[PDB]
Design a protein that fits this description.
The structure is cut from a larger assembly and holds chains A (about 70 residues) and B (about 90 residues). The longest helix of chain A has 30 residues. Chain A contains two helices and no strands. Chain A has one domain. The radius of gyration of chain A is 22 Å and the shape is elongated. Chain B is mainly α. Helix content of chain B is about 25%, strand content about 5%. Chain B has a two-stranded antiparallel ribbon. The longest helix of chain B has 23 residues. The chains are: A mainly alpha (about 70), B mainly alpha (about 90). The chains hardly touch. The structure holds magnesium ion (94 copies). One magnesium ion binds next to α1 of chain A. The structure holds one RNA strand of 641 nucleotides. Chain B: This is Small ribosomal subunit protein uS5m. Chain B: One of its GO terms (molecular function) is structural constituent of ribosome. Chain B: Keywords: Mitochondrion, Ribonucleoprotein, Ribosomal protein.
Amino acid sequence: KNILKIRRRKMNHHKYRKLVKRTRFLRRKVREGRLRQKQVKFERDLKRIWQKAGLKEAPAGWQTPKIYLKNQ
Amino acid sequence: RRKDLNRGQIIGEGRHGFLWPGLNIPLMRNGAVQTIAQRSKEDQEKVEADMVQQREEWDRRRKMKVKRERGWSGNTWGGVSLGPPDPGPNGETY
RNA sequence: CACGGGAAACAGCAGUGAUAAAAAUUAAGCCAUGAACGAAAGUUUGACUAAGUUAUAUUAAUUAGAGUUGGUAAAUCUCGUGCCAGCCACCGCGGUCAUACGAUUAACCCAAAUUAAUAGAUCCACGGCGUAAAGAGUGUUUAAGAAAAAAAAUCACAAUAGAGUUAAAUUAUAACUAAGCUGUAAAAAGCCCUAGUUAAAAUAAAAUAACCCACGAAAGUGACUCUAAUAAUCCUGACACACGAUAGCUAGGACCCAAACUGGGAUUAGAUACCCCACUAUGCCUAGCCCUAAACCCAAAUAGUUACAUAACAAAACUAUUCGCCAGAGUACUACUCGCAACUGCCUAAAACUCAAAGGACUUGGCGGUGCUUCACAUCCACCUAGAGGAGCCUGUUCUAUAAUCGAUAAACCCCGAUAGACCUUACCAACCCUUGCCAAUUCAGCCUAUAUACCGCCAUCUUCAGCAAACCCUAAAAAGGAACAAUAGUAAGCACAAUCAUAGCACAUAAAAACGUUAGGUCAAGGUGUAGCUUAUGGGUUGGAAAGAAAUGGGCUACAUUUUCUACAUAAGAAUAUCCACCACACGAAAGUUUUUAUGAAACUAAAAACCAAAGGAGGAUUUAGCAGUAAAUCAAGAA
Ligand SMILES: [Mg+2]
Ligand SMILES: [Mg+2]
Ligand SMILES: [Mg+2]
Ligand SMILES: [Mg+2]
Ligand SMILES: [Mg+2]
Ligand SMILES: [Mg+2]
Ligand SMILES: [Mg+2]
Ligand SMILES: [Mg+2]
Ligand SMILES: [Mg+2]
Ligand SMILES: [Mg+2]
Ligand SMILES: [Mg+2]
Ligand SMILES: [Mg+2]
Ligand SMILES: [Mg+2]
Ligand SMILES: [Mg+2]
Ligand SMILES: [Mg+2]
Ligand SMILES: [Mg+2]
Ligand SMILES: [Mg+2]
Ligand SMILES: [Mg+2]
Ligand SMILES: [Mg+2]
Ligand SMILES: [Mg+2]
Ligand SMILES: [Mg+2]
Ligand SMILES: [Mg+2]
Ligand SMILES: [Mg+2]
Ligand SMILES: [Mg+2]
Ligand SMILES: [Mg+2]
Ligand SMILES: [Mg+2]
Ligand SMILES: [Mg+2]
Ligand SMILES: [Mg+2]
Ligand SMILES: [Mg+2]
Ligand SMILES: [Mg+2]
Ligand SMILES: [Mg+2]
Ligand SMILES: [Mg+2]
Ligand SMILES: [Mg+2]
Ligand SMILES: [Mg+2]
Ligand SMILES: [Mg+2]
Ligand SMILES: [Mg+2]
Ligand SMILES: [Mg+2]
Ligand SMILES: [Mg+2]
Ligand SMILES: [Mg+2]
Ligand SMILES: [Mg+2]
Ligand SMILES: [Mg+2]
Ligand SMILES: [Mg+2]
Ligand SMILES: [Mg+2]
Ligand SMILES: [Mg+2]
Ligand SMILES: [Mg+2]
Ligand SMILES: [Mg+2]
Ligand SMILES: [Mg+2]
Ligand SMILES: [Mg+2]
Ligand SMILES: [Mg+2]
Ligand SMILES: [Mg+2]
Ligand SMILES: [Mg+2]
Ligand SMILES: [Mg+2]
Ligand SMILES: [Mg+2]
Ligand SMILES: [Mg+2]
Ligand SMILES: [Mg+2]
Ligand SMILES: [Mg+2]
Ligand SMILES: [Mg+2]
Ligand SMILES: [Mg+2]
Ligand SMILES: [Mg+2]
Ligand SMILES: [Mg+2]
Ligand SMILES: [Mg+2]
Ligand SMILES: [Mg+2]
Ligand SMILES: [Mg+2]
Ligand SMILES: [Mg+2]
Ligand SMILES: [Mg+2]
Ligand SMILES: [Mg+2]
Ligand SMILES: [Mg+2]
Ligand SMILES: [Mg+2]
Ligand SMILES: [Mg+2]
Ligand SMILES: [Mg+2]
Ligand SMILES: [Mg+2]
Ligand SMILES: [Mg+2]
Ligand SMILES: [Mg+2]
Ligand SMILES: [Mg+2]
Ligand SMILES: [Mg+2]
Ligand SMILES: [Mg+2]
Ligand SMILES: [Mg+2]
Ligand SMILES: [Mg+2]
Ligand SMILES: [Mg+2]
Ligand SMILES: [Mg+2]
Ligand SMILES: [Mg+2]
Ligand SMILES: [Mg+2]
Ligand SMILES: [Mg+2]
Ligand SMILES: [Mg+2]
Ligand SMILES: [Mg+2]
Ligand SMILES: [Mg+2]
Ligand SMILES: [Mg+2]
Ligand SMILES: [Mg+2]
Ligand SMILES: [Mg+2]
Ligand SMILES: [Mg+2]
Ligand SMILES: [Mg+2]
Ligand SMILES: [Mg+2]
Ligand SMILES: [Mg+2]
Ligand SMILES: [Mg+2]
């Protein structure tokens, strides 16, 4: 009966958790790896604007904070 | 399928071709009490040919037995005529 | 976009390299039309006109071929092959008798085409969302919409948030008292700074009432008291806003008891588990996060109706207004994205690939270390008797050995086909020989050669079990079911059981009987056969030769002795009696061997009898067989071949 659907899920979940334990630190890399792409693409997004709006420098008092890498 | 060997053979019928007064031949002719007689070689070749053609006839008659009217498709019995229902107990007939 | 730059342009007509599953003439004319110029005749026009090439499509006839033939779906015979070679669009076909393969033979249907492939046209949902894919964990509002009348009454009292309080129990820690106390199916470990009693704060958790069904939007909420307090003159509404069980995370407190983890102890093949014992994160408070549930009543909100109406099952069927959600199954509470006080997280959520299914509900079976009742009568347990497993021997399997049968081989084989092998039987091996080679006739005989999963015969087995089965009849449909006796849809001849027969009168007992099916149970070696094979041989004869034991085991026989052994004898007798001791060995036990006879027989290898010899055995491990009365046990005699 419908348990037979749940069994599949139950297994697929278990078999996933196990995986994410072994793979943990590999995972941890690739997460942060993409956060450093994010923050960069983000930056370029704004850089694009100065250069598109004709300004040479980034406007006064702009440090362009890091949102994605926010921790603690 | 079952073939019968009771078909085609008369009494006294034989390959050595004897005509027995009570079986192969009626008991009497214009003259009474025919004796025990033997046919020719060729008369026998003919009667044997007759039995052979009999068997051939029966085999053809067994093979010709495939004919049908189709109901919907082929081996689907849908729409096949079953034939008028059975007369009831009261003599009622359809 | 073309100033400028690459660079030197057929996406005009013909043609050509390269590329691609993709192939028209380097063709003639301005004669018609159209165009450009001309005042005009007219000139030019690879536009166009007429051809040329091509089954690309229709038409006409002169042209006959392709595909199919298990089913959907028109249409098949014989071979070959034997899960191989191969085929199919879907279901599928091939494992020795293939209408599915390859090839014939007939047919079918299309037809100058026919099939295959790939793209289309066509194809979801104005259908759904309890169990099938789908009502979000909860509320309010925005945007957007929908609108006759009635539509705020009260807790039968346990929303929430504060602040204060404690009855039962438990624990520290003392006073006594006894050595144990704890703990399981049974124990062990564990603790004796233990246990019972008498005292007693904190912390934690809230018997009964509750057979109540209230309060909150949901989560949730039921010890006591007081404070604050439960939105909207009440329609729907989000990705916005505010909440959201447990567990978890951060910091600080708390710690009676519980308890993942872990360490002991058992259990177990193992036991990282279930059982036992400790002890920890953690449940508790204050503050901050996390935002998940079988967050399920799997049933959206608000007004209605009980009309119409039974897929199934479950909580009976539906309008109207809305929003939310669902387009096969996996893959996938997944990969990538987006956002989040999360950084083994949450949310949103695909495709490649694979399959022809995946699902829901039901129906009879069978099964169940589910529950309940009732039994077992040689029968499971408890019980009684006598044996098997140990010893010798007999005899059957199984293995080794042999040139040298076959068959049976869980219950349902194993002193089995055999109520029976020295030659014969005989099917076996070894050599030799014979080819219409039993018969009335036959390009015919003969085959203990392969199929017991082609079979008839005879049987085993459930089984001393009560059911099987035609003919009907009923069920808001039927896969199937079909009884209640103060009776509710069943009737029915048949075959089973029962009844009668037999065991020389009864009775009981035994014998017999015991269907339908089940086990593709047994047997092509009783005989007979379907299909296949053999034919100067898988046929038929003569002569010899087989059946040895390292063992392992099934069943028997005889013992192991005093309820015995011997002789007499029929059932009151006399003697012997395992230790003396040097017996001049004897007590039981020789069925075994060595010798001699005799029975049979052409042939002793076979049976019996005497003489000798006297061995293992001193009542048998786990485990097992049988018997409910004239039975078990013991004793004796006969027959079949
Ligand atoms: Mg899986
Ligand atoms: Mg990534
Ligand atoms: Mg057909
Ligand atoms: Mg250009
Ligand atoms: Mg230029
Ligand atoms: Mg070009
Ligand atoms: Mg061209
Ligand atoms: Mg050009
Ligand atoms: Mg080319
Ligand atoms: Mg073409
Ligand atoms: Mg020209
Ligand atoms: Mg043309
Ligand atoms: Mg044509
Ligand atoms: Mg031709
Ligand atoms: Mg093979
Ligand atoms: Mg064949
Ligand atoms: Mg076909
Ligand atoms: Mg074929
Ligand atoms: Mg054509
Ligand atoms: Mg439609
Ligand atoms: Mg429904
Ligand atoms: Mg569902
Ligand atoms: Mg889906
Ligand atoms: Mg709901
Ligand atoms: Mg909501
Ligand atoms: Mg959820
Ligand atoms: Mg408005
Ligand atoms: Mg209204
Ligand atoms: Mg508080
Ligand atoms: Mg107290
Ligand atoms: Mg106390
Ligand atoms: Mg105490
Ligand atoms: Mg106990
Ligand atoms: Mg102890
Ligand atoms: Mg209660
Ligand atoms: Mg309640
Ligand atoms: Mg209110
Ligand atoms: Mg609302
Ligand atoms: Mg929470
Ligand atoms: Mg918590
Ligand atoms: Mg603690
Ligand atoms: Mg304390
Ligand atoms: Mg504890
Ligand atoms: Mg342990
Ligand atoms: Mg075990
Ligand atoms: Mg257990
Ligand atoms: Mg403790
Ligand atoms: Mg709590
Ligand atoms: Mg709940
Ligand atoms: Mg529930
Ligand atoms: Mg749901
Ligand atoms: Mg709603
Ligand atoms: Mg409301
Ligand atoms: Mg109505
Ligand atoms: Mg039904
Ligand atoms: Mg899908
Ligand atoms: Mg989850
Ligand atoms: Mg995820
Ligand atoms: Mg989002
Ligand atoms: Mg017994
Ligand atoms: Mg029994
Ligand atoms: Mg014994
Ligand atoms: Mg023995
Ligand atoms: Mg044998
Ligand atoms: Mg051998
Ligand atoms: Mg055998
Ligand atoms: Mg056999
Ligand atoms: Mg058997
Ligand atoms: Mg026996
Ligand atoms: Mg012999
Ligand atoms: Mg032979
Ligand atoms: Mg075989
Ligand atoms: Mg059989
Ligand atoms: Mg049979
Ligand atoms: Mg009956
Ligand atoms: Mg019936
Ligand atoms: Mg009688
Ligand atoms: Mg009787
Ligand atoms: Mg009997
Ligand atoms: Mg009877
Ligand atoms: Mg068999
Ligand atoms: Mg068997
Ligand atoms: Mg035979
Ligand atoms: Mg035959
Ligand atoms: Mg021979
Ligand atoms: Mg011989
Ligand atoms: Mg033995
Ligand atoms: Mg005995
Ligand atoms: Mg005496
Ligand atoms: Mg002897
Ligand atoms: Mg002796
Ligand atoms: Mg001894
Ligand atoms: Mg036993
Ligand atoms: Mg005799």
